[PDB]
Design an enzyme around this catalytic site. Sequence first.
Site, PDB file in Angstrom:
ATOM      1  N   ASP A 185      60.509   2.562  20.465  1.00  0.00           N
ATOM      2  CA  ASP A 185      59.217   2.733  19.739  1.00  0.00           C
ATOM      3  C   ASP A 185      59.484   2.940  18.244  1.00  0.00           C
ATOM      4  OD1 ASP A 185      57.857   2.400  22.015  1.00  0.00           O
ATOM      5  OD2 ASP A 185      57.650   4.496  22.463  1.00  0.00           O
TER       6      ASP A 185
ATOM      7  N   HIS B 192      60.211  10.050  37.384  1.00  0.00           N
ATOM      8  CA  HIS B 192      61.403  10.587  36.666  1.00  0.00           C
ATOM      9  C   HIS B 192      62.206  11.518  37.600  1.00  0.00           C
ATOM     10  CE1 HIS B 192      60.785  14.895  35.480  1.00  0.00           C
ATOM     11  NE2 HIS B 192      61.963  14.809  34.858  1.00  0.00           N
TER      12      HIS B 192
ATOM     13  N   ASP C 142      66.333  22.052  28.585  1.00  0.00           N
ATOM     14  CA  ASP C 142      66.274  20.561  28.535  1.00  0.00           C
ATOM     15  C   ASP C 142      64.898  20.122  28.028  1.00  0.00           C
ATOM     16  OD1 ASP C 142      64.654  21.343  30.494  1.00  0.00           O
ATOM     17  OD2 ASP C 142      65.188  19.787  31.884  1.00  0.00           O
TER      18      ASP C 142
ATOM     19  N   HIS D  57      62.192  16.571  28.084  1.00  0.00           N
ATOM     20  CA  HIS D  57      61.944  15.139  28.433  1.00  0.00           C
ATOM     21  C   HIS D  57      60.693  14.635  27.707  1.00  0.00           C
ATOM     22  CE1 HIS D  57      63.963  16.187  32.459  1.00  0.00           C
ATOM     23  NE2 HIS D  57      64.881  16.241  31.477  1.00  0.00           N
TER      24      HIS D  57
ATOM     25  N   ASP E 129      58.206   7.854  27.921  1.00  0.00           N
ATOM     26  CA  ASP E 129      58.547   6.588  27.209  1.00  0.00           C
ATOM     27  C   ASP E 129      57.396   5.591  27.369  1.00  0.00           C
ATOM     28  OD1 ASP E 129      59.735   4.596  25.902  1.00  0.00           O
ATOM     29  OD2 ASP E 129      61.598   4.670  26.981  1.00  0.00           O
TER      30      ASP E 129
ATOM     31  N   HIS F  53      56.354  21.434  19.487  1.00  0.00           N
ATOM     32  CA  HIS F  53      55.679  22.213  20.563  1.00  0.00           C
ATOM     33  C   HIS F  53      56.681  22.609  21.656  1.00  0.00           C
ATOM     34  CE1 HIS F  53      52.377  23.561  23.066  1.00  0.00           C
ATOM     35  NE2 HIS F  53      53.061  23.108  24.119  1.00  0.00           N
ATOM     36  N   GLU F  54      57.439  21.677  22.174  1.00  0.00           N
ATOM     37  CA  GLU F  54      58.413  22.043  23.244  1.00  0.00           C
ATOM     38  C   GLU F  54      59.411  23.079  22.715  1.00  0.00           C
ATOM     39  OE1 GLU F  54      60.335  18.347  24.162  1.00  0.00           O
ATOM     40  OE2 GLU F  54      61.801  18.781  22.644  1.00  0.00           O
TER      41      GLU F  54
ATOM     42  N   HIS G  59      58.122  26.522  23.141  1.00  0.00           N
ATOM     43  CA  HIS G  59      58.232  27.037  24.535  1.00  0.00           C
ATOM     44  C   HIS G  59      59.681  27.435  24.809  1.00  0.00           C
ATOM     45  CE1 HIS G  59      54.205  26.334  25.831  1.00  0.00           C
ATOM     46  NE2 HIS G  59      54.172  25.116  25.284  1.00  0.00           N
TER      47      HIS G  59
ATOM     48  N   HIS H 175      51.609  29.725  24.770  1.00  0.00           N
ATOM     49  CA  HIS H 175      50.549  28.938  24.079  1.00  0.00           C
ATOM     50  C   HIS H 175      49.769  29.853  23.130  1.00  0.00           C
ATOM     51  CE1 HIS H 175      51.293  26.321  27.608  1.00  0.00           C
ATOM     52  NE2 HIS H 175      51.181  25.356  26.692  1.00  0.00           N
TER      53      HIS H 175
HETATM   54  C1  LIG Z   1      51.102  19.238  20.306  1.00  0.00           C
HETATM   55  O1  LIG Z   1      52.151  19.274  21.255  1.00  0.00           O
HETATM   56  C2  LIG Z   1      51.789  19.072  22.587  1.00  0.00           C
HETATM   57  C3  LIG Z   1      52.755  19.090  23.592  1.00  0.00           C
HETATM   58  C4  LIG Z   1      52.397  18.888  24.919  1.00  0.00           C
HETATM   59  C5  LIG Z   1      51.068  18.668  25.245  1.00  0.00           C
HETATM   60  S1  LIG Z   1      50.608  18.412  26.935  1.00  0.00           S
HETATM   61  O2  LIG Z   1      49.631  17.371  26.951  1.00  0.00           O
HETATM   62  O3  LIG Z   1      51.818  18.233  27.676  1.00  0.00           O
HETATM   63  N1  LIG Z   1      49.884  19.773  27.504  1.00  0.00           N
HETATM   64  C6  LIG Z   1      48.798  20.420  26.764  1.00  0.00           C
HETATM   65  C7  LIG Z   1      47.450  19.779  26.944  1.00  0.00           C
HETATM   66  C8  LIG Z   1      46.913  18.927  25.989  1.00  0.00           C
HETATM   67  C9  LIG Z   1      45.665  18.367  26.211  1.00  0.00           C
HETATM   68  C10 LIG Z   1      44.992  18.676  27.385  1.00  0.00           C
HETATM   69  N2  LIG Z   1      45.491  19.495  28.318  1.00  0.00           N
HETATM   70  C11 LIG Z   1      46.699  20.028  28.087  1.00  0.00           C
HETATM   71  C12 LIG Z   1      50.101  20.113  28.813  1.00  0.00           C
HETATM   72  C13 LIG Z   1      49.383  19.410  29.799  1.00  0.00           C
HETATM   73  C14 LIG Z   1      48.402  18.314  29.453  1.00  0.00           C
HETATM   74  C15 LIG Z   1      49.567  19.719  31.139  1.00  0.00           C
HETATM   75  C16 LIG Z   1      50.450  20.711  31.523  1.00  0.00           C
HETATM   76  C17 LIG Z   1      51.159  21.406  30.558  1.00  0.00           C
HETATM   77  C18 LIG Z   1      51.004  21.130  29.201  1.00  0.00           C
HETATM   78  C19 LIG Z   1      51.837  21.964  28.299  1.00  0.00           C
HETATM   79  O4  LIG Z   1      51.421  23.015  27.816  1.00  0.00           O
HETATM   80  N3  LIG Z   1      53.061  21.553  27.932  1.00  0.00           N
HETATM   81  O5  LIG Z   1      53.755  22.366  27.025  1.00  0.00           O
HETATM   82  C20 LIG Z   1      50.095  18.648  24.257  1.00  0.00           C
HETATM   83  C21 LIG Z   1      50.457  18.849  22.931  1.00  0.00           C
HETATM   84 ZN   LIG Z   2      61.127  15.013  32.546  1.00  0.00          ZN
HETATM   85 ZN   LIG Z   3      52.601  23.821  26.035  1.00  0.00          ZN
END
Ligand SMILES: COc1ccc(S(=O)(=O)N(Cc2cccnc2)c2c(C)cccc2C(=O)NO)cc1
Ligand SMILES: [Zn+2]
Ligand SMILES: [Zn+2]
Length: 158
Positions: free
Chosen positions: A19, A63, A89, A91, A94, A113-114, A117, A123
């Site tokens: 990408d 995955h 880790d 992920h 893709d 964001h990751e 965590h 959050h």
């Molecule tokens: C800005 O950085 C990020 C990183 C990951 C995500 S994300 O979609 O995985 N996300 C948050 C989320 C977003 C929109 C609607 N619902 C949930 C999540 C979703 C969808 C599901 C389960 C967990 C997360 C999460 O908190 N991962 O860290 C969103 C934004």
């Molecule tokens: Zn993964």
């Molecule tokens: Zn999150």
Amino acid sequence: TLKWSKMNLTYRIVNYTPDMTHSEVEKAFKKAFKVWSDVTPLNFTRLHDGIADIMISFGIKEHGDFYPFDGPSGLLAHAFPPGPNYGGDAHFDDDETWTSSSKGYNLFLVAAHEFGHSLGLDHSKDPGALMFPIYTYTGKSHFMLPDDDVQGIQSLYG
Ligand SMILES: COc1ccc(S(=O)(=O)N(Cc2cccnc2)c2c(C)cccc2C(=O)NO)cc1
Ligand SMILES: [Zn+2]
Ligand SMILES: [Zn+2]
Ligand SMILES: [Ca+2]
């Protein structure tokens, strides 16, 4: 509550996904460490080969896990708590469009964001915090962790 027991950390990029070019992807992760390393005495070292504590890679729908992705939108990426080799880790999907411009899901927004965590942060409810549960685009020109994140990360690492 959960945090690393050492200030030394290492990471390795498994792939740069087609990408974006490798140069664009490399700077994206460096900006994330720079923003987090700005207020954390954590030391991040890039390893050319071998296994590192935090390995980053891009996966696809299936995955090898009971948590398949739901397609392009939804889980943009995920990581495990600070554990031994498996923990720390990270992920990435893709099947999504990773770009450094304001399009689809910006890699830096999800990357930072990751890391939050992995640093033991939960959050945040402030819309200006990166740990906001909803994905939002922001001007990365002068974006700096707000007071909410600084007080929290400092409260964990001091
Ligand atoms: C800005 O950085 C990020 C990183 C990951 C995500 S994300 O979609 O995985 N996300 C948050 C989320 C977003 C929109 C609607 N619902 C949930 C999540 C979703 C969808 C599901 C389960 C967990 C997360 C999460 O908190 N991962 O860290 C969103 C934004
Ligand atoms: Zn993964
Ligand atoms: Zn999150
Ligand atoms: Ca998804």
